[PDB]
């Protein structure tokens, strides 16, 4: 989940 958001941003 954390990684997904870092990637999105």
PDB file of N, CA and C in Angstrom:
ATOM      1  N   UNK A   1       0.801  -1.205   0.000  1.00  0.00           N
ATOM      2  CA  UNK A   1       0.000   0.000   0.000  1.00  0.00           C
ATOM      3  C   UNK A   1       0.849   1.278   0.000  1.00  0.00           C
ATOM      4  N   UNK A   2       1.868   1.313   0.859  1.00  0.00           N
ATOM      5  CA  UNK A   2       2.766   2.447   0.955  1.00  0.00           C
ATOM      6  C   UNK A   2       3.453   2.691  -0.405  1.00  0.00           C
ATOM      7  N   UNK A   3       3.966   1.611  -0.985  1.00  0.00           N
ATOM      8  CA  UNK A   3       4.662   1.708  -2.263  1.00  0.00           C
ATOM      9  C   UNK A   3       3.735   2.240  -3.361  1.00  0.00           C
ATOM     10  N   UNK A   4       2.511   1.726  -3.414  1.00  0.00           N
ATOM     11  CA  UNK A   4       1.550   2.145  -4.416  1.00  0.00           C
ATOM     12  C   UNK A   4       1.404   3.682  -4.450  1.00  0.00           C
ATOM     13  N   UNK A   5       1.295   4.267  -3.255  1.00  0.00           N
ATOM     14  CA  UNK A   5       1.127   5.708  -3.129  1.00  0.00           C
ATOM     15  C   UNK A   5       2.400   6.461  -3.520  1.00  0.00           C
ATOM     16  N   UNK A   6       3.564   5.961  -3.092  1.00  0.00           N
ATOM     17  CA  UNK A   6       4.816   6.571  -3.526  1.00  0.00           C
ATOM     18  C   UNK A   6       4.908   6.592  -5.047  1.00  0.00           C
ATOM     19  N   UNK A   7       4.539   5.491  -5.690  1.00  0.00           N
ATOM     20  CA  UNK A   7       4.567   5.400  -7.142  1.00  0.00           C
ATOM     21  C   UNK A   7       3.572   6.374  -7.770  1.00  0.00           C
ATOM     22  N   UNK A   8       2.332   6.375  -7.290  1.00  0.00           N
ATOM     23  CA  UNK A   8       1.316   7.253  -7.835  1.00  0.00           C
ATOM     24  C   UNK A   8       1.829   8.712  -7.881  1.00  0.00           C
ATOM     25  N   UNK A   9       2.549   9.089  -6.820  1.00  0.00           N
ATOM     26  CA  UNK A   9       3.003  10.467  -6.620  1.00  0.00           C
ATOM     27  C   UNK A   9       4.383  10.718  -7.194  1.00  0.00           C
TER      28      UNK A   9
END
